[PDB]
Amino acid sequence: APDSVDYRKKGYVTPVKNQGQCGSCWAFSSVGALEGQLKKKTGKLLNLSPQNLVDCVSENDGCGGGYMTNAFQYVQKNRGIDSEDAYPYVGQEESCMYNPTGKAAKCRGYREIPEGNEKALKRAVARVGPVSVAIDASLTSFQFYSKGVYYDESCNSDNLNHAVLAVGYGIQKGNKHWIIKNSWGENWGNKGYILMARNKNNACGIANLASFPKM
Numbered sequence: 001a002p003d004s005v006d007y008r009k010k011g012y013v014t015p016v017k018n019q020g021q022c023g024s025c026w027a028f029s030s031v032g033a034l035e036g037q038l039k040k041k042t043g044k045l046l047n048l049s050p051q052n053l054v055d056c057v058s059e060n061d062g063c064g065g066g067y068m069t070n071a072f073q074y075v076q077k078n079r080g081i082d083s084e085d086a087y088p089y090v091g092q093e094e095s096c097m098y099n100p101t102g103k104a105a106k107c108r109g110y111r112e113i114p115e116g117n118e119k120a121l122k123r124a125v126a127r128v129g130p131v132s133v134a135i136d137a138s139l140t141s142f143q144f145y146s147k148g149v150y151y152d153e154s155c156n157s158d159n160l161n162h163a164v165l166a167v168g169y170g171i172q173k174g175n176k177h178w179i180i181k182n183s184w185g186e187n188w189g190n191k192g193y194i195l196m197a198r199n200k201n202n203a204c205g206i207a208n209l210a211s212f213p214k215m
């Protein structure tokens with residue numbers, strides 16, 4: 001795998017979004033991994049719909065939280081997911097309003113990275129494209145992150161509670177990192193991104209619940 005990769009450079013990542021007060025980070029992480037594959041498979045970059053997932057993944061809990069593997073299973077079983085324009089984000093749970101006419105992507109299933117394997121996570125981002133990841137984002141240092149390579153020893157790999165997307169990895173000033181896209185708006189972190197330490201004992205549990213969709 002290459003020493004570093006940055007999908008933002010390849011045009012594989014859509015602009016950073018803002019989930020608002022809904023616990024829909026899982027839907028944004030899932031659509032980001034799907035938009036990454038959609039760009040690789042069609043050459044077009046376009047926003048997928050987080051709202052479609054929030055109201056349609058009955059296996060999940062709306063604004064009450066959920067998992068990306070559950071979202072990829074819904075897209076596969078449903079034979080599609082709508083584009084954000086066809087199904088706009090409103091930030092609150094509503095009845096399922098999926099419309100096949102607005103279908104913008106399909107999924108044929110998914111794959112999860114070996115648990116805690118930072119090496120296998122690296123091989124996947126490099127081989128597949130952006131990958132959905134779960135992290136413990138409960139620390140004040142994470143919430144107020146601004147720059148550099150994030151690392152807080154108090155982060156708990158066993159307390160996963162937020163979903164984000166790995167769009168690459170590299171090194172900055174000698175510190176290996178994962179390039180993470182959040183869905184807290186462009187004003188959060190560095191233009192809505194955070195570089196998280198890579199190979200530092202799976203900091204924040206970044207390789208514990210990683211997955212990507214098959215397309």
Ligand SMILES: [Ca+2]
Nearest residue numbers: 059069070073
């Ligand atoms: Ca499931």
